[PDB]
Symmetry: C3
Subunit: 308 residues, 3 copies
């Protein structure tokens, strides 16, 4: 098999999202910029390492790449590559805007092409099955569009960012009904339970992208999106003993994107003097959870239970 | 069997919602306050009686309470207790704001805890079934959140109200697709047909809550929500001969919450000089339907066909 | 059988939508009004011819009319009659406002009555099946409401237009999830594949209607709706070789409504100086695609492959 699962890209993805969330606290806290820089450098290094590993996979393990691309459930994890590329471009924008824009456009084109080629291929039917309705499907259709929208808004293309954000939002509210229904009826296998954290992702990623696009203005839509995000967060907090029934694993980094987007939206809300206490709680909770995830990953690395 | 089904809480729920709807007409019509006071007193008395009966059930009939709580379909009717508590707090706010705040917070915490503990256990799967996709599922996930949002907005917590309202709105949008697909596909048994009136609830409850949070401002969203609510109302008016195929019963009070929320939104729209004729029609229709429901309940009581 | 399928009403429907889209360019170009007049006249003549044919069907082929009305999948194509009537009224409004108002109201009442009588009758269940979840279901529930909203906004009833538009929008958001899940799971048989173009319709019809009611003001909602519409357009562009696997046919006119609504929204966006390049591309693409559809229809007519 391949040592690096394609789902391990959630490590740099979550770290970069948290780096951006901290970066938004540049003014109110002098060390916020330093924390953002450290997180961004770590995420960029991890992303470079994983990109090299995946290039090696393509060069010498193309059979596995084809198998995961054509699978109706495993294909959605290939969408983490463009998402993490766009997040790394967002990080680099603070240093070299040209390289940041190049990375952002590469990731946006890649994710849009992947969604067009593969997500639309499912409509042909036959390959997708009722048991393939997993939370990971958010990555190509929802998370990618929100990340591209936020990145484009960072570059100044606010109308294109609005287009991408709306595509992602409508795809999210169009897919989540059937996903939650499947979860209610058909449960979820222990190996796929760790991906339940992606359910927390869209609600907070949407508000983060919206606040990025509209210059951090806390409209009614942002409050509504936090309402749903906090409902989802409570639901998943209740289910966490069930999610980790088989034990801790690197698959829990799926919660990282949702937690980091929650932190980013918390900074945006705090800047707006809206629900300051709830914003502080959300930011602290996201940071603590991602820190626990980092500690778990370090423990796995020391123990050797990280690579496959 | 207990003489009081948990679904009988829709009587005080509908009466209190109608009381608030009338209360919103305090200034325009001198006897609107008197009608609101009468309806609120009746709803509060009925709610106190039902709370005492349910406490008796918990004390001496806890087996039935456990059975209904663990049932994937009957659990949703326990969400009527916090909803009615919050509505009674809304009523009492006109007299004793402290007791009203206590009741509203108790109901909000109770419904949020119930949704976290039970509506999220369904995602584990195996207990919820495709045949359990009933309109009553709106009560814990949707109706409770909207009622809590409106109640909090009544206390002055407009941002927290916005959070709760958004949670309820997105939960409604996420659940209704599968519910309507099930209704189209698998029909609905005569015993559960009376609960079809809960389909009318979310569309009008959402607009009522929205007009409560935003100071009764008739935005585009309120007009959209009435559009869908009236589409649903026509759909259910066509189906009413089918809904009462086996005859009238106390289960028809499910329509009461939707009708009362329609009346409340009608008052809000009339105050805004938006669709005044439609608002008058909606208010009169809601009042007449709830009066017919009250007459039916009184006839059942006199006939002795009310308690089980 | 009867020579004219009920789905052939998409020819006048698409032509009239394109005529309105061009008419919106009256001021910018001198010949935009001439093109709009030509398209509207052709659409009106075709609609009159098809109305006469359908009246003949009702008089002497009522068995087929009843069979298609009671069919859970074929009933949705009867909604093309009121939709095309409302579009023809919109066209005529530029010449004789009284006849335009009469036609618009006739179509609105007809489509609302059809939706109430038939779309709500499906909730009884037992006739609708999981394999009847076809894209054509958008016509009675979604497309009709959007067209009615646009037509009413044309007459000056902007609040009633908002009601209808919201009804259509929420109906679309509520139906699309299960439709796309069915498409992913099952597979539109070749004879029903041509109707896949109706998936492109709601996203752009919604934004066209919204820009009609709100005086062509490009708001965040319009940008979001284009985001989803372009995602859908790319998805269907990828699938087009699969959609026409068995060859081109008159069923491809289902794409006509979506393309014409895209052109209309493109004109509205261009007027607002929002994404002018994307607006130009969308308008040109819609016109070229509808022109190709017209050429295909003319070739079918010359080849004698149009009527059954």
């Amino acid at each position: 098999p391949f040592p690096l699962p394609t789902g391990y890209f959630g490590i740099p993805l979550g770290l970069a999202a948290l780096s951006l969330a901290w970066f938004h606290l540049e003014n109110l806290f002098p060390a916020a910029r330093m924390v953002s820089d450290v997180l961004g450098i770590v995420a960029s290094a991890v992303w470079i390492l994983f990109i090299l590993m995946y290039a090696y996979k393509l060069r010498y393990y193309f059979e596995e790449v084809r198998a995961e691309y054509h699978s109706p459930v495993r294909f959605s994890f290939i969408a983490l590559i463009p998402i993490t590329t766009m997040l790394v471009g967002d990080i680099l924008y603070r240093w070299n805007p040209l390289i940041a824009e190049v990375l952002i456009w590469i990731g946006t084109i890649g994710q849009l092409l992947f969604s067009t080629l593969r997500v639309s291929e499912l409509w042909q039917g036959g390959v997708f099955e009722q048991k393939s309705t997993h939370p990971s499907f958010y990555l190509p259709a929802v998370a990618a569009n929100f990340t591209s929208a936020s990145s484009l808004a960072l570059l100044g293309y606010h109308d294109l960012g609005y287009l991408f954000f709306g595509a992602g939002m409508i795809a999210w509210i169009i897919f989540e009904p059937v996903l939650l229904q499947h979860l209610r009826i058909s449960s979820l296998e222990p190996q796929f339970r760790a991906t339940m954290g992606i359910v927390l992702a869209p609600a907070f990623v949407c508000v983060s992208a919206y606040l990025s696009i509209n210059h951090g203005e806390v409209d009614t839509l942002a409050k509504i999106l936090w309402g749903y995000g906090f409902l989802q967060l409570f639901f998943l907090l209740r289910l966490f003993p069930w999610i980790v029934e088989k034990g801790l694993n690197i698959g829990l980094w799926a919660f990282s994107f949702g937690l980091a987007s929650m932190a980013n939206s918390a900074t945006a809300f705090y800047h707006g003097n809206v629900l300051q206490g709830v914003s502080i709680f959300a930011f602290v909770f996201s940071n603590v959870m991602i820190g626990l995830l980092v500690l778990m990953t370090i423990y796995k690395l020391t123990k050797g239970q990280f690579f496959l």
